[PDB]
Design a protein around this ligand. Structure first.
Ligand SMILES: Cc1cc2nc3c(=O)[nH]c(=O)nc-3n(C[C@H](O)[C@H](O)[C@H](O)COP(=O)(O)O)c2cc1C
Ligand SMILES: Cc1cc2nc3c(=O)[nH]c(=O)nc-3n(C[C@H](O)[C@H](O)[C@H](O)COP(=O)(O)O)c2cc1C
Lengths: 133, 133
């Protein structure tokens, strides 16, 4: 499959897709797609080369953080549902998928992130539970 | 971004991703990912070089067909929720996004399809609306 098609497929994805690399305790972003920019509200120039933890804002007491750190250290993919905050400050539920992959071009392991906004389904399920009473 | 990472990003996608080319009134499949292979129940060798309309089965009375057909003619992406049937015969709801992309290698327009399963949400909305009254 051609590389231009793959880049287009990434650029056409509804879910957000990012690529990040490890720099100590930070995993700084090296690629984001348009979907990620519209989901998070930040432009490409602002958040490039930054760890995604800024999406958590002040809600930094989420147990999923430790699970993410364990998964990335051990080279395992992981899936976590987190509360994240856009640039304007509005909250949303982000189903995040992290996948570590070893690039053979430079023998470096990178991390692929897929973000899904699941706020709508969270609200729907909650309302169904309320009506169940 | 290198092609190996792009193929990894596509094969790790939660939604199904496919690539198809135009042959008259048919849009023949040239690529599927693992998620699509396990969602439809068909192997790559079975569905290669065939238009995806077989997923509709006998339920060919879906208006989205017309909308899909017009969208591809004008080179516009489109999003439609359709009824599809697996190889075994079980039914599901597919939110499909079609995006035309210009490949420069051959200056040919290809079509990227992204499929998301919305059956669970469809049932949620059904039950919430029913109990809602
Ligand atoms: C590719 C990638 C994408 C990530 N995307 C998000 C994200 O969208 N939202 C989020 O809250 N954390 C995200 N994270 C996790 C944080 O960036 C961070 O790595 C994790 O919370 C570890 O927490 P710590 O930095 O406090 O140790 C992502 C991590 C990676 C590797
Ligand atoms: C890239 C691509 C992916 C498609 N994926 C699906 C699909 O997953 N399910 C489906 O029912 N139709 C899908 N279609 C639509 C059918 O393949 C077909 O093109 C459509 O029904 C157009 O009208 P026709 O059936 O009269 O030709 C897809 C079309 C394209 C171009």
């Amino acid at each position: 499959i051609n590389a231009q098609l793959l880049q287009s497929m990434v650029d056409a994805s509804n879910d957000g897709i990012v690529v990040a690399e490890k720099e100590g305790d930070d995993t700084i972003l090296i690629y984001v797609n348009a979907a990620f920019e519209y989901l998070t509200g930040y432009s490409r120039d602002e958040i490039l080369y930054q760890d995604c933890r800024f999406l958590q804002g002040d809600d930094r007491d989420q147990l999923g953080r430790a699970r993410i750190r364990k998964a990335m250290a051990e080279g395992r993919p992981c899936r976590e549902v987190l509360r994240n905050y856009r640039k304007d400050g509005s909250a949303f539920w982000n189903e995040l998928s992290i996948t570590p992959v070893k690039s053979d071009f430079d023998q470096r392991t990178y991390f692929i992130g897929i973000q899904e906004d699941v706020s709508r389904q969270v609200e729907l399920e909650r309302e169904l539970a309320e009506l169940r009473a």
